[PDB]
Amino acid sequence: MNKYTIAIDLGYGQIKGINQDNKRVIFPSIISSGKDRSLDTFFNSIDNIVDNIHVKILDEYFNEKEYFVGELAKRQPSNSSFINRDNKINSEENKVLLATALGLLIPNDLPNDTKIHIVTGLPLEHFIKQKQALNDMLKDFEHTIKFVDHNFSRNIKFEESNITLFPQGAGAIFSKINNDISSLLIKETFIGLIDVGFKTTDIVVFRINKDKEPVFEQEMSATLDGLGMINIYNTMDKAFTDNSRDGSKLNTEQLMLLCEEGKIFFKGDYIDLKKDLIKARKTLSTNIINKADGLWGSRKNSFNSIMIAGGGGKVLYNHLKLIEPNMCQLIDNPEFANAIGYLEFGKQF
Amino acid sequence: MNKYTIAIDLGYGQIKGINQDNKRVIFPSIISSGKDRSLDTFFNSIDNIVDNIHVKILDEYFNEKEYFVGELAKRQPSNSSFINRDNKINSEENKVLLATALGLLIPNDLPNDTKIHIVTGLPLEHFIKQKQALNDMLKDFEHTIKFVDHNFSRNIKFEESNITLFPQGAGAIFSKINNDISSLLIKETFIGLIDVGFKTTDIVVFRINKDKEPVFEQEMSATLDGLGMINIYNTMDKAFTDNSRDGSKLNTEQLMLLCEEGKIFFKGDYIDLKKDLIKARKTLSTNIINKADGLWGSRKNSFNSIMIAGGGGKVLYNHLKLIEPNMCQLIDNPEFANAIGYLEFGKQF
Numbered sequence A, B: 001m002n003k004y005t006i007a008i009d010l011g012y013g014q015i016k017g018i019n020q021d022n023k024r025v026i027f028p029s030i031i032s033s034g035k036d037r038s039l040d041t042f043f044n045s046i047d048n049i050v051d052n053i054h055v056k057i058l059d060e061y062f063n064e065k066e067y068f069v070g071e072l073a074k075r076q077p078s079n080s081s082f083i084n085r086d087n088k089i090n091s092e093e094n095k096v097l098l099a100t101a102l103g104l105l106i107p108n109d110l111p112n113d114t115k116i117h118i119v120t121g122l123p124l125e126h127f128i129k130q131k132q133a134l135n136d137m138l139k140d141f142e143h144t145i146k147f148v149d150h151n152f153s154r155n156i157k158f159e160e161s162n163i164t165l166f167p168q169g170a171g172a173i174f175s176k177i178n179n180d181i182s183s184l185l186i187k188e189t190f191i192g193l194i195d196v197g198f199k200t201t202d203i204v205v206f207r208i209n210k211d212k213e214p215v216f217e218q219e220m221s222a223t224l225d226g227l228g229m230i231n232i233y234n235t236m237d238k239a240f241t242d243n244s245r246d247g248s249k250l251n252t253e254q255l256m257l258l259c260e261e262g263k264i265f266f267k268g269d270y271i272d273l274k275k276d277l278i279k280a281r282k283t284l285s286t287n288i289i290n291k292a293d294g295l296w297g298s299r300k301n302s303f304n305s306i307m308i309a310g311g312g313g314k315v316l317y318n319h320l321k322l323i324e325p326n327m328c329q330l331i332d333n334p335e336f337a338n339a340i341g342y343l344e345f346g347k348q349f
């Protein structure tokens, strides 16, 4: 039989993955040590595993470790702080996320002889830099995952010539739109994906040729490293302590709940910080537009379709529209632009 | 008669020896024939005599037989078999290996009448069984050594009152910690010494009395024959045929090369067995602690300090930590633990 295919993303906000059979999972990039759950099972019936990932993972010692990951880790008081999370792609923090991303996206009772084309991702300026670090991790990733309170296990191990690395935004606009953007690309134009992520924002362009095929440019395209949603959480963390004036600083959930809405429910009251949320987004909108003119001279006028991506692009699509209005548009899945872009451009082999 | 002192060992993995002047040598217990080293002499400087032991050996019938021994014999393909080596202490192998480190540690400018006190060792359980045979052999010893490529020779012959017979691990914590553990030993405790050698594993304890004197317990102390580093080399060798997936097999030099590192360079590329190296070393460490507690019931609670000896325990110390944490510890010279213990406790005469 043919080899299976899974395209995941190790993005800093949330793991965004999809398989060969077009089933997708999404959960935030927070881990926590798992503790025994049969009690909270009894109060509320679990119909979603994604909310409730209690899970055991074997290792090279074949020693299991309980984990809370995803939505269940965010409610825990003892989880990862998630603002000082490592960029080391071979870390166990990245392993458990990658274990669950490969754990959910495998259906039951597959033949054990076949292997899976896994397709991961890297930052654009850190693709070459962190190429062999994930190559070492995926060669080292020999683990057996066991979902507690769902009771289905996967033996996840990969040899050589099965992993496939791509940069972020590589196949999201090269592929994934090529069947639909081919009528829009005409002659010597630039398409551009702008993925607004957690830690970084990512700019990738593709010149199409005379023969209507896109080709890459790296001096018009880079990673806005350290510029992204991370500037919004850190600013709005100070915005609460400026508005509380008590020394009360938000925890992991309260800050993440804040920048989605702007009204944290503090002491039986919503503390209004909608205006400072606009200001932190506008400074992020400042630091992507002015950096775009650093990468683009008059070639911003040489665009036919700007696309913006990322979950951070969802709340900023009309706000980051001021790059080139009436030409920029939204990618059809704002979160899953990279993953399906990894899927279609991973099936080219 | 200011008689000299040299303390040696008969370790199967390698020979460990030291003189009165604390000059110490270490070399593997591998022999081969001696062939004329004049061609390589002009190429590379034969400088380290311990690395390059081409040695001329006479007997009582003046039968000169050159031998490559040690590191150079390990480089030879036609070397001693050494993984199924005969355990006869009166072997010609042991005739060479004992006479090897003598002239390598017999100093210059000795008086005419002055002899040398030699201190040797036996396995602890076989110290009753094999006391006669080494005493047969040391009385037998009447030879003459000569060093090719370094241009000096020694006379070598001994009688009784020059011989000294203490078992393996006997004087290592009797002396060598004697005035140092005296502040640690207080009242009615045991001290732990475990020799993790190549072929054999020794366990030896000492009850200290009310009078701060160590006394020996033969029933809490035994030689674990068949347990040691020789299991790990033999385990990973079949594992090398596994991960190569071709039935190809190492040589004797690659055998000792492997489980010092675990990443053997084979057919233009590394072959990775690092997982199984962690597996087998933890597996042997499991087998030590259980057989340690085979002799140790609740008398493990009557310990105050455990030391480990042998070359294996130095690289097992993280996994041999699980006997009693922060009470178990590593001796400073894991190889020369028996040697200095043979030295000072051999200096009774």
Ligand SMILES: Nc1ncnc2c1ncn2[C@@H]1O[C@H](COP(=O)(O)OP(=O)(O)O)[C@@H](O)[C@H]1O
Pocket (backbone or CB within 6 Å): A009, A010, A011, A012, A013, A014, A015, A016, A196, A197, A198, A199, A200, A229, A259, A260, A261, A309, A310, A311, A312, A313, A314, A315, A334, A335
């Ligand atoms: N509905 C929403 N409201 C507010 N912010 C959102 C929403 N959806 C996503 N986000 C933001 O987008 C980020 C997700 O970015 P993502 O596309 O996963 O990039 P990365 O690949 O860097 O993780 C989150 O950290 C979150 O702050």
Ligand SMILES: Nc1ncnc2c1ncn2[C@@H]1O[C@H](COP(=O)(O)OP(=O)(O)O)[C@@H](O)[C@H]1O
Pocket (backbone or CB within 6 Å): B009, B010, B011, B012, B013, B014, B015, B016, B196, B197, B198, B199, B200, B229, B259, B260, B261, B309, B310, B311, B312, B315, B334, B335
């Ligand atoms: N640096 C090292 N790395 C791996 N193994 C080692 C190292 N040093 C010593 N050893 C192991 O320890 C053994 C030496 O044990 P040793 O103390 O000489 O006991 P014996 O008296 O039985 O020969 C060797 O066979 C070797 O496998």
Ligand SMILES: [Mg+2]
Pocket (backbone or CB within 6 Å): A011, A012, A168, A195, A197, A310, A338
């Ligand atoms: Mg992203």
Ligand SMILES: [Mg+2]
Pocket (backbone or CB within 6 Å): B011, B168, B195, B197, B310, B338
């Ligand atoms: Mg020994």
